[PDB]
Amino acid sequence: MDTTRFIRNFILFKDALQKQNFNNKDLNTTSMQAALQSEQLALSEESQYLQSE
């Protein structure tokens, strides 16, 4: 993974899933899983953007 993009996506997913509606452990876990899936998607984004460029 890329680290800083993972940190920004983790922060953004903790902002979208607002923590008032969430237990903290499940919030951090769901944000981490969604950020890992976002990294797996962003790899293919990098490949497609290189091809389009």
Place this chain on the structure above:
Amino acid sequence: MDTTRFIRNFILFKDALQKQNFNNKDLNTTSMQAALQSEQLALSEESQYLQSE
């Protein structure tokens, strides 16, 4: 993922699934999962639109 398209799709899925019928945590979770699937589809949309162009 692309961030601003994810934010707009998250907002639109929270408008479609109206929050009067939804508990807030499950609403935000289903909107986040649908927005991630929409990003995974929009990658292939970008590839197909580049090919069609």
Place this chain on the structure above:
Amino acid sequence: EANEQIASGSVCLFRSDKVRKHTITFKAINTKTSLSKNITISVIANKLKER
């Protein structure tokens, strides 16, 4: 946006801290001639953090 150097060569990492639409100019100077090119990167605020 006027001449302010923000990178070194062929790659740029554009942090904004603004709201406006920025216009970044790629510049290739040489002993013979020089070239420039414009790109427009629009910044928005987070819709979730607002109100």
Place this chain on the structure above:
Amino acid sequence: MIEVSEVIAKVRERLNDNEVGNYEILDSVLVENINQALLKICLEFRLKKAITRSLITEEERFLTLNNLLGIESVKLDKKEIESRNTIEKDTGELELLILSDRISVTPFKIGELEVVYYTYEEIRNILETIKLPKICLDVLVYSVLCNLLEIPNNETNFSVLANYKQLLKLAKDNLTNYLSLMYSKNIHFSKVVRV
């Protein structure tokens, strides 16, 4: 005194409908449901006692009350009226005729009526104010909220309604506590039966 704004705000928050723009539940619906809640609350607890002392003659025979819930004492020229009826008996014992918020005397006799009854003072605008003790707030919310939860928005709405029923029961217990502390004697022993 309770403002309608705070009842409405609590109900909107509880229904996950605290959005100014959308308002999935129209304010007319909320004001009607609040009127229903005031009905039930004032009936069950006999909150509002009103006294009306008018005169009935052969010209006008009926006494038009307003938002009637029940009659607990009737006097005609300082004479107790005993039975209640809705049938307009021709003659016999002297009874009180009730005609759906119109009061008269059955074997009609000229005189005056001193009637004790119960009232709503229901609301019609969001900017109005409910003249009830503040302790009655939670019983107004939890009672109007159970009236709206049974819109089929969610598949688990009835369990939520069941939880709000217990919350309403506790609120009514608090209200009974308040009413006993206000309008009841401060006694600690009973009296011996005297026959």
Place this chain on the structure above:
Amino acid sequence: MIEVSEVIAKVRERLNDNEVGNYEILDSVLVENINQALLKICLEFRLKKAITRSLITEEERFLTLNNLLGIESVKLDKKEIESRNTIEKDTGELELLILSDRISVTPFKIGELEVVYYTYEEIRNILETIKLPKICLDVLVYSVLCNLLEIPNNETNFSVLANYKQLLKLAKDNLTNYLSLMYSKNIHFSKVVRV
């Protein structure tokens, strides 16, 4: 004395809303809920007794109290007032008329009223201070927290509310312990019935 800041901080921490920037729950909502909690706490435990000794004449007939919860003793010229009513009886026994935080005497007689009642001293600002024993802190939190948990943020909010109800019951037990130690006799035996 309890500062409102510490009650608010505990509630914010407990609601997973201890974020200065966001504040998903507005401070107006918290102050209103704290007022409700003070209502319920002061009603159930009769925490605050107040004495008012005014005079009623034909010019002004009513005694305006404030944040009334209950009346436990009324004297008129050092004469006990016995019954309570809200109907303005014309004549008969001498009763106390209660008009939703206005006190008078029903078959009106010129004189003075010495009334013992209960009070809120509710709050309106986050920087205020609640004049209650510190032992009352946990009962204020756990009671206002059960009022906010039933916003449908989570699908398991009502079980959490049920847990907080038991916690509140224990807090009330502690408060009763304190009140008995303060305002009750230190006795260890009963007295024989004397008839």
Place this chain on the structure above:
Amino acid sequence: MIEVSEVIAKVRERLNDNEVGNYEILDSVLVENINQALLKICLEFRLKKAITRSLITEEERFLTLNNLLGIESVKLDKKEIESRNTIEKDTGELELLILSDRISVTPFKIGELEVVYYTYEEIRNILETIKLPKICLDVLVYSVLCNLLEIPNNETNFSVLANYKQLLKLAKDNLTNYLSLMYSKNIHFSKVVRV
């Protein structure tokens, strides 16, 4: 005597927050919670008895105590004061007026007050020391720990709180054992009732 450092360290270890750099729970929060725990512990077990023997005259009428929990004996010029009240009765029997950590005499009489009461000596700094028996350590931890476990960090926080409640009950049993061994008679038989 218990140092605050060791209570804090045990709580940090138990909360999986024994990290010097991070400190997810601020030390102000811990010191406030420890003050709450000292409140509850000293109230329930009547740990600290204090005696104050001052004089009240017409100039200064009230006796300002500190961290009051309960009054168990009042003497005025070696005369027992019987009842307790908070209402400032004008005349009658001689009662003790309590004004939220201010003590006076209700139908005021010049004299002296010898009052036995209970105290906190609460803490405000992490480097302070709690003047309590060391056996009271586990009851301070397990009681302050149940106050912090109900922050919604985990979905299984309330079962953990329930376990810590039983642990706290055992700690209180140990504390009662200690208190009986210290401040109670060493007797093995009862006395016959003498009437």
